[PDB]
Amino acid sequence: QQERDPWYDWDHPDLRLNWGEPIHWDLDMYIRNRVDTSPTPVSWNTMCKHLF
Amino acid sequence: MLKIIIPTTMLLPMTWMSKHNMIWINATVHSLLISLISLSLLNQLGENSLNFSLTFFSDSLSAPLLVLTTWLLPLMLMASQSHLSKETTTRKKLYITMLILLQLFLIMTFTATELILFYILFEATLVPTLIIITRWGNQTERLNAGLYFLFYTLAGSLPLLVALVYIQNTTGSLNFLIIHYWSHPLSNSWSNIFMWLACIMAFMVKMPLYGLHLWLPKAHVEAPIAGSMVLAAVLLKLGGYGMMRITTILNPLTNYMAYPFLMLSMWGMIMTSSICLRQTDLKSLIAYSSVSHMALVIVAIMIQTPWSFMGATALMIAHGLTSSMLFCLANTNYERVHSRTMILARGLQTLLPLMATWWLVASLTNLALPPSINLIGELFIITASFSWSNITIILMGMNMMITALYSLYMLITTQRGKYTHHINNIKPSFTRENALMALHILPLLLLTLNPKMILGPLY
Amino acid sequence: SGYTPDEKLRLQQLRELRRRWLKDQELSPREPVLPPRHSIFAVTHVLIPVWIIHYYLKYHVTAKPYTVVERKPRIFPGDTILETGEVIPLMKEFPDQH
Amino acid sequence: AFSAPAAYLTHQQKVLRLYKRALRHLESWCVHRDKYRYFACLMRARFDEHKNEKDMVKATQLLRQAEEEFWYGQHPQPYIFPESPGGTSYERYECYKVPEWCLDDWHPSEKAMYPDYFAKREQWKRLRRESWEREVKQLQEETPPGGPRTEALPPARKEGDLPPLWWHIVTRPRERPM
Amino acid sequence: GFMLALELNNTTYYLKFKYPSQTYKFSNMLGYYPSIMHRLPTYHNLSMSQKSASS
Amino acid sequence: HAFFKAMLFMCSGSIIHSLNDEQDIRKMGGLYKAMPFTTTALIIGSLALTGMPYLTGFYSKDLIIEAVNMSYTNAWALLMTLIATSLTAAYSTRIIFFAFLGKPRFPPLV
Amino acid sequence: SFPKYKPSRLATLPATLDPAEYDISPETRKAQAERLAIRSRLKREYLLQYNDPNRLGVIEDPALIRWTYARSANIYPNFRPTPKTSLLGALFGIGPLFFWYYVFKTDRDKKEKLIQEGKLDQTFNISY
Amino acid sequence: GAHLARRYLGDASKEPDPLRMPTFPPDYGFPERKEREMVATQQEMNDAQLMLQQRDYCAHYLIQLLKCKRDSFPNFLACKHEQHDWDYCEHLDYVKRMKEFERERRLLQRKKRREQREAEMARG
Amino acid sequence: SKMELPDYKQWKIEGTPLETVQEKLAARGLRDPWGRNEAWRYSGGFANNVSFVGALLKGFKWGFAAFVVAVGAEYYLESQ
Amino acid sequence: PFINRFFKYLLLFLITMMILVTANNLFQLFIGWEGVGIMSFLLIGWWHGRTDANT
Amino acid sequence: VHIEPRYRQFPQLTRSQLIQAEFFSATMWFWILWRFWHDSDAVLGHFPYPDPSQWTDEELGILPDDE
Amino acid sequence: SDAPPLTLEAIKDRVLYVLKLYDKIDPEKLSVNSHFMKDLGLDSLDQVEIIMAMEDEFGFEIPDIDAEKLMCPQEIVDYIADKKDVYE
Numbered sequence A: 001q002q003e004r005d006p007w008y009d010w011d012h013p014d015l016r017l018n019w020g021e022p023i024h025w026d027l028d029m030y031i032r033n034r035v036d037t038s039p040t041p042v043s044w045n046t047m048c049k050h051l052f
Numbered sequence B: 001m002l003k004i005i006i007p008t009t010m011l012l013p014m015t016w017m018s019k020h021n022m023i024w025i026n027a028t029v030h031s032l033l034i035s036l037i038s039l040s041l042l043n044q045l046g047e048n049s050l051n052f053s054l055t056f057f058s059d060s061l062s063a064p065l066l067v068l069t070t071w072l073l074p075l076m077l078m079a080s081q082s083h084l085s086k087e088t089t090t091r092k093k094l095y096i097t098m099l100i101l102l103q104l105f106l107i108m109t110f111t112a113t114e115l116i117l118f119y120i121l122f123e124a125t126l127v128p129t130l131i132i133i134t135r136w137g138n139q140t141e142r143l144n145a146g147l148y149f150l151f152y153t154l155a156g157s158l159p160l161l162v163a164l165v166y167i168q169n170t171t172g173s174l175n176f177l178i179i180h181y182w183s184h185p186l187s188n189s190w191s192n193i194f195m196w197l198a199c200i201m202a203f204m205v206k207m208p209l210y211g212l213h214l215w216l217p218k219a220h221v222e223a224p225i226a227g228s229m230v231l232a233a234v235l236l237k238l239g240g241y242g243m244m245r246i247t248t249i250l251n252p253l254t255n256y257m258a259y260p261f262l263m264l265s266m267w268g269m270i271m272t273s274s275i276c277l278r279q280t281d282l283k284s285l286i287a288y289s290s291v292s293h294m295a296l297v298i299v300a301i302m303i304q305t306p307w308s309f310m311g312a313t314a315l316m317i318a319h320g321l322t323s324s325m326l327f328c329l330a331n332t333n334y335e336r337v338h339s340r341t342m343i344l345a346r347g348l349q350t351l352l353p354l355m356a357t358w359w360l361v362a363s364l365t366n367l368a369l370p371p372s373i374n375l376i377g378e379l380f381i382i383t384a385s386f387s388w389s390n391i392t393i394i395l396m397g398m399n400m401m402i403t404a405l406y407s408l409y410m411l412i413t414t415q416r417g418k419y420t421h422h423i424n425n426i427k428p429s430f431t432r433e434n435a436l437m438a439l440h441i442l443p444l445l446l447l448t449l450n451p452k453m454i455l456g457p458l459y
Numbered sequence C: 001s002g003y004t005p006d007e008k009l010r011l012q013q014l015r016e017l018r019r020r021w022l023k024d025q026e027l028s029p030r031e032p033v034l035p036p037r038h039s040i041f042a043v044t045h046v047l048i049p050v051w052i053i054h055y056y057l058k059y060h061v062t063a064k065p066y067t068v069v070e071r072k073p074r075i076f077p078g079d080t081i082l083e084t085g086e087v088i089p090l091m092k093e094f095p096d097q098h
Numbered sequence D: 001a002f003s004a005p006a007a008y009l010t011h012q013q014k015v016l017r018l019y020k021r022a023l024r025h026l027e028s029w030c031v032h033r034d035k036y037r038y039f040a041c042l043m044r045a046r047f048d049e050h051k052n053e054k055d056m057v058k059a060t061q062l063l064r065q066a067e068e069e070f071w072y073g074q075h076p077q078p079y080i081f082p083e084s085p086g087g088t089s090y091e092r093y094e095c096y097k098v099p100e101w102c103l104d105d106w107h108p109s110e111k112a113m114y115p116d117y118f119a120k121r122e123q124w125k126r127l128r129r130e131s132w133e134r135e136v137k138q139l140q141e142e143t144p145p146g147g148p149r150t151e152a153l154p155p156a157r158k159e160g161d162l163p164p165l166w167w168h169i170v171t172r173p174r175e176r177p178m
Numbered sequence E: 001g002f003m004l005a006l007e008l009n010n011t012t013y014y015l016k017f018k019y020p021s022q023t024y025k026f027s028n029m030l031g032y033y034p035s036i037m038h039r040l041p042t043y044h045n046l047s048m049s050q051k052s053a054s055s
Numbered sequence F: 001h002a003f004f005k006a007m008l009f010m011c012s013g014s015i016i017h018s019l020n021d022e023q024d025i026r027k028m029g030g031l032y033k034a035m036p037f038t039t040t041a042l043i044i045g046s047l048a049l050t051g052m053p054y055l056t057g058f059y060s061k062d063l064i065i066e067a068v069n070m071s072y073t074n075a076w077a078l079l080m081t082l083i084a085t086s087l088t089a090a091y092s093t094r095i096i097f098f099a100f101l102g103k104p105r106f107p108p109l110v
Numbered sequence G: 001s002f003p004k005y006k007p008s009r010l011a012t013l014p015a016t017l018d019p020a021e022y023d024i025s026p027e028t029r030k031a032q033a034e035r036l037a038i039r040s041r042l043k044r045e046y047l048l049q050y051n052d053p054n055r056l057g058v059i060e061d062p063a064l065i066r067w068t069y070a071r072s073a074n075i076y077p078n079f080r081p082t083p084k085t086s087l088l089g090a091l092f093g094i095g096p097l098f099f100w101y102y103v104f105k106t107d108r109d110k111k112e113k114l115i116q117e118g119k120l121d122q123t124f125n126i127s128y
Numbered sequence H: 001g002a003h004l005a006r007r008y009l010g011d012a013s014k015e016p017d018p019l020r021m022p023t024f025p026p027d028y029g030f031p032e033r034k035e036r037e038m039v040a041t042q043q044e045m046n047d048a049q050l051m052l053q054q055r056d057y058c059a060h061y062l063i064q065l066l067k068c069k070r071d072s073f074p075n076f077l078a079c080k081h082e083q084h085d086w087d088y089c090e091h092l093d094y095v096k097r098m099k100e101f102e103r104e105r106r107l108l109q110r111k112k113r114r115e116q117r118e119a120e121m122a123r124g
Numbered sequence I: 001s002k003m004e005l006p007d008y009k010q011w012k013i014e015g016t017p018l019e020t021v022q023e024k025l026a027a028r029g030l031r032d033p034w035g036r037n038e039a040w041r042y043s044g045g046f047a048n049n050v051s052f053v054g055a056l057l058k059g060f061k062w063g064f065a066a067f068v069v070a071v072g073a074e075y076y077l078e079s080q
Numbered sequence J: 001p002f003i004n005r006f007f008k009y010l011l012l013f014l015i016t017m018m019i020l021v022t023a024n025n026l027f028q029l030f031i032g033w034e035g036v037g038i039m040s041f042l043l044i045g046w047w048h049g050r051t052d053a054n055t
Numbered sequence K: 001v002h003i004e005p006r007y008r009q010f011p012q013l014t015r016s017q018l019i020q021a022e023f024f025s026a027t028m029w030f031w032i033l034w035r036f037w038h039d040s041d042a043v044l045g046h047f048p049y050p051d052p053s054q055w056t057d058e059e060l061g062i063l064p065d066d067e
Numbered sequence L: 001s002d003a004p005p006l007t008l009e010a011i012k013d014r015v016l017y018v019l020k021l022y023d024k025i026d027p028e029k030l031s032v033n034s035h036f037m038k039d040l041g042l043d044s045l046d047q048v049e050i051i052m053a054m055e056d057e058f059g060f061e062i063p064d065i066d067a068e069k070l071m072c073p074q075e076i077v078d079y080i081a082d083k084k085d086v087y088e
């Protein structure tokens, strides 16, 4: 839900969801209080190498 | 102890003879008086138990359980009268009759001096609970929930009956005092192994042990609020009480028959705590919480140390109070919005601040914030397990972290954020609901002030 | 580019209505209609609490052994003891590395 | 946030959005104002160099190249306005926002204070109750048979009509409610 | 440290613009510790607690 | 450390409140003259954090460094301690240069 | 020209870096038009009840109901015992139990053997 | 340090080992050595409750400094002569330790070279 | 209270680094149409500011004077 | 609008920190430990309508 | 005290804040100079660090490479 | 206290100030209803720069979809007033 457009007029602003639209199976994992899959400046598989 | 039994039997015709508009008032007042009377049972001795007669006795393990039962009756009465307003007078009286009969059976179960009488009462507690669930539940899943609740219990309890009558034919008595004084060790044979299993599995399924708990989410979600209160607060503790009673005759066989149940308890504790992290129904989360806490209680009973028994007693009392409070908190929102989905109604702290404070205190006691009796029990059990084996701390440690995570997840999902825009029927909290929450929470801290009253006979 | 006449007109009407609502949110002068010594802090917040604490420690806490334990006071050469009156000798004729 | 979106963006819209993003990230890199002005003028010259390309294929190829360069050279910690969706004060005052329908449940003693405010509230409620059916019927008339195709709403056209679906836009809580 | 930081802050006044190095990206993004440790363990834990424990 | 760390955060809060709840240093200009007392306090706190002689920071950090140097210890730990105590002065310098020196970069409604 | 960015599961591909949105077809434009039409129709259906003066309550959402029902009640009816299902169930439900059993049994056997030989340093171990 | 570079890069054979030191008898090279004496009694040190680490050979100066500090309590700037005396004693102790380290290095270098050159004499 | 914006025509890039920026963009054929919007950051009381070393030695003169007079008093106070 | 609550919260944190600091047994120290932890949790999410604060 | 916005001008400063800032900067610098004048050993070290090489073998007791 | 209660007159004054500090717009020829494309002869990039200049002046960003639409100073002032709940 972090990747959704924050400038859109969502029915539920906090959840960034619209009434009646299909809900992802793993929505509770993605509620943006939680796991974030948003694109990063540096690639994955490059951050891991540097950190390790 | 007929001075407590007889007043409840009098609650029965008092309810059935009351005016149509005074049943709740009369039942609540006299239930509270009976609780005050039962408060006298806390004056216990240091060496033996209070032996009232040939039939009833009171120990330092059963007195807090009796007090909890008698205190839980009025709270259930207050919690039930909201959603039963449109019901007819006769059916309301029948509901109160079911609750009174359940209390009477529970009171007699915790003080029976013989194991067969204890069995008969501990099995008689089934009928009122099943009737309540299947008659006054809301959804069509209540019938299946009642079937699951009945058969899971009976399939464990019938071998216990066979084992009990066999033991009485062998040793000549089932009286608990005689059983304790004339105890003899159990050899290592297949007959003794199956006797152990028959004496243990019914209480295991009552806790319930992980893998045998599938009935509990169904029954505790599909029941009405009073049913959920009494199922979580008192009826799960029958297994723990019975297990601590029966383990007297199971030594030294337990020394190795406890391994599968210990592994199941620890790993399934981790699993049920993890399950609580992805739950869309708010009541199922509280049910799985109960499963995790009861797994801890099972571990404590199985390792058989004084510290583990003290921790088990304290944890059972604390969990009863906390889980009943959490169920009532969820039922308030359900009555407001007629849905159990957790992410439907959000930002409720903005609309209901005092109810948010009650939510915060309940979820703080759920995660065992010190010096609550929840943490006293949990820490005693953890220390006993560490003495049993130093590697349990890892599993125990993981559980503590997970419990905090899902408790605060529930709190943040329900109370914080922004209120859903379309829901405009969230009325202010009634005085009844606030009084219910206060009567749940104040005894917890009061008991924290004097913790030797819930630490059991091993104190 | 820009708005269309429909959007411009709808924004105009909504803006007028919203400003009317915001104006209506204002309070008239009478709106909050309410229906019908110097050093006393140092007495009720310092003196009174320390009276209860000192009484509780002097006559209740110290009525049992090992409840208030104080580490023994340091003793130095050339000191004299209050109770016994014993004096402690000096310190072994310093080599005087002046 | 106020306008209804379209089914897609156009090429010039994408170019303008990339231009704004690049200017903002360059300002993030160039902290000082004179250096920012220098490099912003350079960026504008670079943008308007290829302004006159009549081959749309090569225009989109250049846009793709520019987006790739921007992603490689973006600021990892760009400046965000405090109330923008990533700022330090983005949703700070959302907990103070209370919907207007909550006032319907105030105790009469609470409503005894503020009589004129509640009189105005009653007037507004009567206005909404009178205008609802006209709004619904206007929406019914102006809607194509195959349902609406955008999220744009029609305005009021008649004598004393109101723009349909206005109550929850007009009666927003506030931006600084408490 | 004072002198080196002063030099590296004075050079920001120059009209020169160069893309950042990987050392700067490591320092600014906190070594990518929150970028990886707040996404991989949480994802695997929650996904396993749904797919395996519950279902 | 309690003293100067708390006062450094307090000066940061003062700057944040004055500039309409802005926290980014890239939009903080020349506050050396516009904020004389805040500038004085932040300079004193930065000098104490860096263990300037005879200040509060010095009576602990100086002894800590000189006791790390005269002990049988891991050599890598000593090297990292020295590099970190250089980076401390470097970060403190960054706040002062960016927040207090130069020309304004905040919105024009002062 | 510049180093390339490769997407991952927990760090996805940006929209401006997606080749599929830079080579478009009128079929794609038609699909976007249909998507916007469906979204707008759902939005209008919601807003009609949202602004209704006589509506008191919770506006029911069939999407939320479908989500919860799929996550809870629709799972077992759509379950088939397959080699994958059987292997994953056996592994994740059986392996941890015997792993922890082996660990705890080994630890306690070692402790008991040490106790038998009289060398465990149980001095001051009053409480268990 | 230079001793660390000498030990970890140069010949570690003739470099003293800080953990295993000394390796030579205390009276090896010296004809006679005075026994290092102590000024403060064990009972005095116990009564003053110094520390297990401050009970070194300079403990008497520390006792004097502590007594002067307790006597001159409000004037916390009067205990300078005693503090200087204690610091001087500790400096002399550190000088002695440096000397011990110095002694160990030369003996190790001298003994090993002398025995290897005697082996060289025996090799011809 | 009740204060109006200054005249917009007093903002000139004349004599500020914006001058230099304009010269270097003129050397390339470009132009900077926004310098006057940034001229206020250099125009008035923000014209000049101290250096890092100048900031660090903020109150050194007064403190040094007090230190010197106190040391002199110490030196001709031990003559008692 | 809730400054009184904020002041009460700050005071609560101070009390728990004193309990932590003066504790003589491990149970009292743990009480102070968890008290300051809970107080910091409540004070970090002071603006409870903001998702990042709760996170 | 009332200070009004300026809109692109240097903000209004009251005499007291500059007086306080200068006073505290001056007192810090005076404290540093005074405490260095009276406690220079705390920064420069107090006792001379000796050199091992200049210690004679007589006081260090090493044999003349013969025994 | 905090910042004063921003009014429509102040918003318009600041918008016109920023627009008259623009070198590509003549001061006197500019009016509160002047169109950016028709009357003033600016392209899209100049409009983007003007939107960014407005953002800097008021301290808050404007979404691109909303920003594209404004064409005259009246639209900018109206959008700012509607955003910040300015009614007087």
Ligand SMILES: CCCCCCCCCCCCCCCCCC(=O)OC[C@H](COP(=O)([O-])OCC(O)COP(=O)([O-])OC[C@@H](COC(=O)CCCCCCCCCCCCCCCCC)OC(=O)CCCCCCCCCCCCCCCCC)OC(=O)CCCCCCCCCCCCCCCCC
Residues within 6 Å of the ligand: E001, E004, E005, E008, E019, E020, E021, E023, E024, E025, E027, F079, F082, F083, F086, F087, F090, F094
């Ligand atoms: C005399 C006896 C004592 C001798 C001590 C040592 C003697 C040498 C003296 C010189 C010491 C260092 C002097 C400066 C160092 C570099 C300065 C610098 O900034 O360079 C710019 C450059 C980046 O500049 P930029 O990104 O264009 O600038 C940003 C913009 O200007 C945008 O600007 P902005 O506003 O964002 O500002 C950026 C910011 C931040 O700038 C950066 O982003 C880069 C930060 C670099 C400084 C880091 C210093 C601490 C390094 C600790 C390393 C720990 C181990 C790491 C292990 C990594 C393992 C993967 O710049 C600063 O704030 C100043 C930076 C720090 C200045 C003061 C440095 C003091 C500490 C070092 C001197 C210590 C003196 C006392 C020593 C006492 C020893 C007993 O960074 C570097 O290239 C040099 C950093 C050193 C990294 C070397 C690591 C090796 C890389 C290759 C790996 C090979 C892998 C092999 C195969 C592996 C297979 C597994």
Ligand SMILES: CCCCCCCCCCCCCCCCC[C@@H](O)O[C@H](CO[C@H](O)CCCCCCCCCCCCCCC)COP(=O)(O)OCC[N+](C)(C)C
Residues within 6 Å of the ligand: B188, B189, B190, B193, B210, B211, B212, B257, B260, B261
């Ligand atoms: C899903 C959750 C359900 C609840 C979990 C209930 C847990 C029940 C587990 C029972 C625990 C132990 C039962 C028997 C004790 C020992 C088990 C046996 O494997 O140990 C060896 C036994 O050796 C061999 O294993 C023989 C048994 C092999 C046949 C048993 C069938 C096990 C297959 C698994 C079926 C699943 C059972 C549960 C159904 C759900 C010991 O060697 P031995 O010394 O000789 O026997 C000791 C008895 N003596 C002294 C009289 C001789």
Ligand SMILES: CCCCCCCC/C=C/CCCCCCCC(=O)OC[C@H](COP(=O)(O)OCCN)OC(=O)CCCCCCC/C=C/CCCCCCCC
Residues within 6 Å of the ligand: A032, A033, A034, A035, A036, B397, B398, B401, B405, E034, E037, E038, E039, E041, E042, E043, E045, E046, J052, J055
């Ligand atoms: C000891 C047993 C366990 C030890 C820990 C192992 C890993 C624990 C895995 C925890 C799984 C929890 C799943 C659900 C958590 C709640 C969801 C969640 O927190 O999402 C991530 C959430 C949001 O992300 P942000 O970056 O803050 O973005 C905010 C701006 N948008 O942030 C978090 O809370 C992530 C926290 C996860 C940390 C797990 C990694 C820690 C591992 C520590 C190992 C090192 C041990 C230390 C050794 C010390 C030396 C003796």
Ligand SMILES: CCCCCCCCCCCC(=O)SCCNC(=O)CCNC(=O)[C@H](O)C(C)(C)COP(=O)(O)O
Residues within 6 Å of the ligand: D011, D012, D013, D015, D016, D022, D025, D026, D029, D046, D047, D048, D049, D050, D051, D052, D053, D059, D062, D063, D066, D067, D069, D070, D073, D074, D075, L043, L044, L045
């Ligand atoms: C800090 C690091 C980030 C910086 C990296 C970014 C680098 C990008 C620089 C190079 C990219 C370009 O210029 S790519 C230029 C692409 N060329 C075309 O699209 C030709 C057709 N013209 C049009 O479509 C419109 O006229 C339009 C031009 C949009 C104006 O719109 P108005 O006139 O109607 O307002």
